[PDB]
Design a binder for this molecule. Structure first.
Ligand code: HEM
Ligand SMILES: C[C@]12CCC(=O)C=C1CC[C@@H]1[C@@H]2CC[C@]2(C)C(=O)CC[C@@H]12
Ligand SMILES: [K+]
Ligand SMILES: [Mg+2]
Length: 407
C-alpha cells in the first residue's frame, strides 16, 4: 500500500512481521504514529545503545512538548504506559540509583538461588495442571494453563502478593494492556490497581515479611527512605513487568522451538544450552515490541539528523533484535547456534536496563526443559503461524497456544 513517510503502528497487530521489517528498513530513526500521536522510533541497534545512555533523553512525561501543550491527555489509550507514579521507571539521574538499588540487590543471581525452589514448585504444579487438562488427548491452551499463571505466582511470591489476590491482578492487567478496553474503563482499572497496591504497602508497613516489598519499605539502616509513592511505583513496575514480559518469553520460546524441531533437539540433547535458546528467543521474538517513551530536554544532533527538544522517542526493541548490521543477513531466522544470539539488548541498555533479567532468564531456564522433559511429544493442535497476537501494541502478547500433550 502507498508510500507513507510516517509509519502507523497497527494496534490490531495485523502484520507484525511486515511492520517490523518496514521499521528496520525505514531507520535507524524514523517517524511513527501511535493512535494519532507522533513520535520517533529507534529501530537501530547501535543508535539505540547510544541513545539509551544519552542524558538528554528522559522518562519524565513533563519533558514532552505534547504533554506541555495539552495535546496529549489521559484520553490517549496509550497513556498508562508512561503517565505513572514516581519510580525507577520515571526517574533519571543521581536520584535514579536510589530507586533501583534494593531491587537490583534482591535480584542478583545468588539472591535468586533462594527463590529457585519456589519457582520449581510452581512449574511442577502447573505441569500437573497441564497433564490433567491434556488427558484423553484433549486440546489444551498452554498459555492459560501454564505460561500465563507461572510468572504471576513467581513475582507475587517475591513481592508478597497474597495467593488469593493474584487472579484479580491478572484481570486488571488484561484490561490494562488491551487496546480494546474502553478508555474510561482503562483509567478506572488503573485507579483500582493503584488503590490495591497502596493498601498492599500499608499492609506490609504494619506487618513486614521476607519479601521485596517489605525491603523497599524498610531499607538498609541509614539511607533516606523511599516515599510512599516511590515504594508503590516500584511495586507496580515490578509486578506489571515481571508478569507480562515473562509470559511472552515462555510462549515464544516454545513456539520457536516447536517450529524448529532440530533446534529443540540440540537443547534436549545437551549440545546447546537452554539458556542460549532463551537468548536467541529474546533477540528474535522478544517480549517487548515498543518501549514508550523518552523525551529530549534539548535538541540532540546526531550528525545528519536532529531530535528536537520535546520530541518523543520510542525504542522499537523488536525491530532492533532484527538488526542485520549486527546479526547478519539471516537476522529474520531463529537460530540458537548463531554467534550473536546473546548480543541483543532486548532487556534494554543504560541506567534503565531491566533489573529482573536474571529472574526472567531463570524462570525460562527452569520452565522450558521441565515442560519438554515432562511432555516430550508435546505438539501444536493449531498451526503455529496461526497463533494471533492480542491487540496489545507495545507487548508481544500471544492470545492462546493450543497444544496436545502427545504420545
Ligand atoms: C522476561 C523478559 C523481560 C524483558 C524482555 C524485559 C525487558 C525490559 C525492558 C526493555 C525494560 C526497559 C528498557 C528501557 O528502559 O528502555 C525493562 C525495564 C524493567 N523491567 Fe523488565 N524485562 C523482563 C522481565 C522482567 C522481570 C521478570 C521484572 C521484575 C521481576 C522486570 C522488571 C523491570 C523493571 C522494574 C523495569 C524498569 C527499570 C527502570 O526503568 O529502571 N522485568 N525490562
Ligand atoms: C508501564 C508499566 C505498567 C503500568 C505501571 O504502573 C508501571 C509500569 C512500569 C513497567 C512497565 C509496565 C508495562 C510494561 C513494561 C513497559 C514492560 O514490558 C517492561 C517494563 C513495563
Ligand atoms: K499519575
Ligand atoms: Mg517518502
Amino acid at each position: 500500500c502507498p508510500h507513507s513517510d510516517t509509519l502507523t503502528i497497527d494496534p490490531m497487530i495485523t502484520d507484525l512481521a511486515g511492520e517490523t521489517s518496514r521499521l528496520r528498513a525505514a531507520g535507524p530513526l524514523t517517524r511513527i504514529d501511535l493512535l494519532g500521536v507522533p513520535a520517533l522510533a529507534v529501530t537501530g541497534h547501535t543508535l539505540a545503545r547510544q541513545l539509551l545512555t544519552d542524558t538528554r533523553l528522559v522518562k519524565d512525561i513533563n519533558a514532552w512538548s505534547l504533554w506541555q501543550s495539552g495535546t496529549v491527555t489521559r484520553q490517549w489509550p496509550l497513556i498508562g504506559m508512561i503517565d505513572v507514579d514516581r519510580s525507577m521507571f520515571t526517574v533519571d539521574g543521581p536520584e535514579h540509583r536510589r530507586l533501583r538499588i534494593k531491587t537490583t540487590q534482591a535480584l542478583t543471581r545468588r539472591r535468586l538461588d533462594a527463590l529457585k525452589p519456589t519457582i520449581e514448585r510452581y512449574v511442577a504444579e502447573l505441569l500437573d495442571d497441564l497433564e490433567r487438562a491434556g488427558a484423553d488427548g484433549a486440546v489444551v491452551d498452554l498459555k492459560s494453563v501454564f505460561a500465563y499463571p507461572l510468572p504471576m505466582r513467581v513475582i507475587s511470591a517475591l513481592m508478597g502478593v497474597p495467593s488469593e489476590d493474584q487472579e484479580q491482578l491478572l484481570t486488571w492487567y488484561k484490561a490494562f494492556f488491551s487496546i480494546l478496553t474502553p478508555q474510561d474503563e482503562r483509567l478506572r482499572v488503573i485507579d483500582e490497581m493503584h488503590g490495591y497496591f497502596t493498601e498492599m504497602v500499608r499492609r506490609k508497613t504494619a506487618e513486614p515479611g521476607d519479601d521485596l516489598t517489605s525491603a523497599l519499605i524498610y531499607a538498609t539502616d541509614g539511607e533516606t527512605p523511599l516515599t510512599e509513592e516511590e515504594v508503590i511505583g516500584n511495586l507496580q513496575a515490578l509486578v506489571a513487568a515481571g508478569h507480562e514480559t515473562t509470559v511472552s518469553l515462555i510462549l515464544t520460546a516454545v513456539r520457536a522451538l516447536l517450529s524448529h524441531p532440530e533446534q529443540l533437539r540440540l537443547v534436549r540433547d545437551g549440545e546447546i544450552g537452554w539458556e542460549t535458546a532463551i537468548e536467541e528467543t529474546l533477540r528474535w521474538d522478544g517480549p517487548v515490541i515498543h518501549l514508550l517513551m523518552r523525551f529530549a530536554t534539548e535538541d540532540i544532533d546526531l550528525g545528519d539528523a536532529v531530535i528536537p527538544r520535546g520530541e518523543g522517542v520510542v525504542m522499537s526493541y523488536r525491530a532492533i533484535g532484527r538488526d542485520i548490521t549486527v546479526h547478519g543477513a539471516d537476522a529474520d531466522d531463529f537460530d540458537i547456534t548463531r554467534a550473536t544470539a546473546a548480543r541483543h539488548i532486548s532487556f534494554g541498555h543504560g541506567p534503565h536496563i531491566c533489573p529482573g533479567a536474571a529472574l526472567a532468564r531463570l524462570e525460562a531456564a527452569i520452565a522450558l526443559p521441565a515442560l519438554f522433559t515432562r511432555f516430550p511429544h508435546l505438539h501444536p493442535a493449531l498451526p503455529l503461524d496461526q497463533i494471533p497476537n492480542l491487540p496489545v501494541l507495545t507487548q508481544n502478547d500471544l492470545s492462546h497456544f493450543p497444544i496436545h500433550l502427545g504420545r
